[PDB]
Structure 1
Amino acid sequence: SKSKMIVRTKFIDRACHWTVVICFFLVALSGISFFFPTLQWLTQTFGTPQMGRILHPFFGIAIFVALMFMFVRFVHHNIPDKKDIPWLLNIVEVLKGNEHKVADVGKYNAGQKMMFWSIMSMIFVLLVTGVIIWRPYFAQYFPMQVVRYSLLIHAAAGIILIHAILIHMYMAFWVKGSIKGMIEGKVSRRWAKKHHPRWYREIEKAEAKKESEEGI
């Protein structure tokens, strides 16, 4: 416990994450321009409206590829367990900045895991429905009725994921010190103690113990 910080995120998972974020800004904004045509300015997200129609789906595929790399590296830490119940019951208390007092928080809390599955499920929905409605390459192989349902579902899934990311960015801005961990990779031990007790307890034990195991 004699270091200002502890590593929370490896460089590879940090590089990926900020790649996703940049791709997501372009894809969400172009998507929103088709959804709300009154917001004319967003038709210039990829330069021109004609260009935006072409590039949206390609950047969409890139997000899904990078989210699948994230999926295989974080899924094991996002698994719901009986210890998450406490969180789910004192949500009102957590939102007032008192989660430590009410719950058992490991690597990622119960909100973060709900988000994780939400985000991962929506991107799968968006990938499937996106392919189905993609002209000129793929929509021609699908029955008109499936294309129509896909148009409805893709719009709805994209809106749900945008909401979700608005809340995800808010929380990251709100639980102070979090953005620095995602940019630089390190979290101060006290942040760990307050927001993620069980997690830091494990690092601290893994740490000390294996260095005690060496035989100083």
Structure 2
Amino acid sequence: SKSKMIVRTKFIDRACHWTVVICFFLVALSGISFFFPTLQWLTQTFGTPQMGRILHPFFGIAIFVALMFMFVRFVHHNIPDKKDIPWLLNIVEVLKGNEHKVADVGKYNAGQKMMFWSIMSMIFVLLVTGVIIWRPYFAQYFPMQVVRYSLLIHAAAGIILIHAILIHMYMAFWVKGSIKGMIEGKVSRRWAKKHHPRWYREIEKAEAKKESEEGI
């Protein structure tokens, strides 16, 4: 407990995350330009409308690949458990900035875990429906009816994921100190105590204990 910060995120997972964010900006905006044609400016997300049509799916694939790297590195820390119920029941209290008083928060809270699975499920849905509606490469192999359903679902999934990310960014901006941890990798012990009690308690113990195990 004698250090201003503690490492919350490794460089590799920070590099990935911000790669996903940049790709997502382009993919979400191009997608929105097809969804709401009145927002003409967005048809220039990838330069020209013709270019955007081509690149959207490629950058989409990149996001999926990167999110799968994130999946295998973060999933075990996002597993729902009985300790998450307390959170789910005092949501209104958590949003007022009083979560500590009402819940048991480990590495990532119950909201972050719900977001994680929402994000991971939607990118899978977007991958599958995206491939199906992809011309000229793949749409040809699918029955027209399947292509039609996929067009409906892909649009819906894309919108759901964008809403989710809006909320994910907000929260990140809201629980102050969070963005620095994702850019630099470190969180101050007090930030850990307030927003993620159980989690820091574990690092603190893992820490001290194994250093006490050495035999100072």
TM-score, structure 2 length as denominator? 1.00
1:1-216 mapped onto 2 (5 Å cutoff) = 1-216=1-216
User: Structure 1 residue 115: deviation in Å?
Assistant: 0.0
Deviations 1:133-189 (A, max 9, x none): 000000000000000000000000000000000000000000000000000000000
For 1:15 and 1:23, how far apart are their aligned partners in 2?
13
Q: Secondary structure at the match of 1:94?
A: helix
Deviation (angstroms), 1:39: 0.0
Residue-by-residue CA offset, 1:172-216 (whole Å, 9 max, x unaligned): 000000000000000000000000000000000000000000000
C-alpha distance in 2 between matches for 1:158 and 1:212: 50
Q: Aligned-pair distance for 1:44?
A: 0.1
Match of 2:171, SS? helix
Measure how far apart 1:27 and its partner are. 0.0
Aligned-partner Cα distance in 1 for 2:213–2:2: 19
Query: Structure 1 runs of 4+ off > 2 angstroms?
Result: none
CA root-mean-square deviation = 0.1
> Is the partner of 1:129 in helix, strand or coil?
helix
- Once the two structures are superposed, residues 114-138 of structure 1 have per-residue CA deviations (whole angstroms, 9 ceiling, x without a partner) of 0000000000000000000000000
SS at match of 1:3: coil
1:11 shift after superposition = 0.1
C-alpha deviation, 1:66, in angstroms: 0.1
| Percent of pairs with identical residues | 100
Cα shift at 1:69: 0.0
1:94 shift after superposition: 0.0
C-alpha deviations, 1:95-122, integer Å up to 9, x for none?
0000000000000000000000000000
- Give me the whole-angstrom Cα distance separating, in 1, the residues matched to 2:60 and 2:39: 21
Q: CA deviation at 1:83?
A: 0.0
- Secondary structure, in 3 states, of the residue corresponding to 1:79? coil
Secondary structure of the 2:106 match is coil
Q: CA deviation at 1:82?
A: 0.0
Provide the C-alpha distance between the structure 2 equivalents of 1:154 and 1:175, rounded to a whole number of angstroms: 31
Unaligned runs of 5+ in 1: none
- The separation in 2 between residues aligned to 1:133 and 1:45, in whole angstroms, is 20
Residues in 2 aligned to 1:90 and 1:38: alpha-carbon distance in whole angstroms: 40
Structure 1: how far apart are the matches of 2:165 and 2:158? 11
